[PDB]
Write a protein that binds this ligand. Structure first.
Ligand SMILES: CC(=O)N[C@H]1[C@@H](OP(=O)(O)O)O[C@H](CO)[C@@H](O)[C@@H]1O[C@H](C)C(=O)O
Length: 216
């Protein structure tokens, strides 16, 4: 299937790095964060990728271009207003079309093997969950994801989404989580618990951890 990489974040918590460099282009062990995803996606057999952007967006396009160096075809979804994760995905849906797509949070660094998500999957959404880095986000019972409360897990920012998840939505800014929680209540969200390496690189301290973990 196709993949979307979320890359529109302003990365205020990573200043001053993100003053002239958008977060997805920040180097982790010599390589831009987002290029780990592109190489892994290409290795997993993905050939078409959509990348949304806002803050310093044109630098992302200039650096990556059409993606041919990665064996990929990249299309961009520019945002001129903050749309959040849900609104950003919605704006990009015409580029993704009607079929389920892989969704990856650009800020994440992870070992996770994207080719795993090509296996037969469950629901309007299939979420990869990780140990809390914390009250967590969600709970996993067997393969079914439910809302968190008391052994909770954290959403990794890695998932497969069905465009139908967004049926009825209106253009504009809105968050993804509330939509997932609405699908969970309908029993349409499956998931899995990944126990390997995963870091949400939102701060210089997270950058370091990723650096350290990549040292193995
Ligand atoms: C959309 C998404 O990937 N949300 C995840 C992302 O959020 P981020 O830190 O990038 O803002 O990483 C967090 C863990 O660090 C999760 O709790 C987030 O999922 C929760 C459900 C959320 O969106 O509120």
């Amino acid at each position: 299937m196709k993949a979307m990489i979320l890359a529109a974040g302003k990365g205020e918590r990573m200043r001053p790095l993100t003053l002239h460099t958008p977060k997805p282009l920040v180097p982790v062990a010599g390589q831009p964060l987002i290029e780990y995803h592109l190489r892994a996606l290409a290795a997993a057999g993905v050939t078409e990728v959509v990348i949304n952007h806002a803050w310093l967006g044109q630098q992302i396009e200039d650096h990556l271009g059409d993606g041919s160096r990665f064996g990929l075809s990249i299309r961009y979804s520019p945002e001129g207003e903050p749309l959040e994760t849900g609104g950003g995905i919605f704006k990009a849906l015409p580029l993704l079309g009607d079929a389920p797509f892989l969704l990856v949070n650009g800020d994440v660094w992870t070992d996770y093997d994207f080719a795993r998500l090509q296996a037969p999957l469950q629901g309007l959404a299939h979420l990869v969950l990780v140990d809390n880095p914390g009250r967590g986000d969600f709970r996993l019972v067997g393969e079914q994801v439910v809302d968190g409360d008391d052994g909770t897990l954290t959403f990794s920012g890695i998932s497969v989404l069905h465009p139908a998840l967004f049926e009825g939505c209106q253009a504009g800014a809105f968050k993804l989580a509330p939509l997932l929680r609405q699908a969970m209540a309908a029993g349409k969200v499956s998931g899995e618990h990944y126990r390997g390496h995963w870091v949400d690189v939102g701060t210089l301290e997270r950058l370091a951890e990723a650096e350290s973990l990549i040292g193995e």
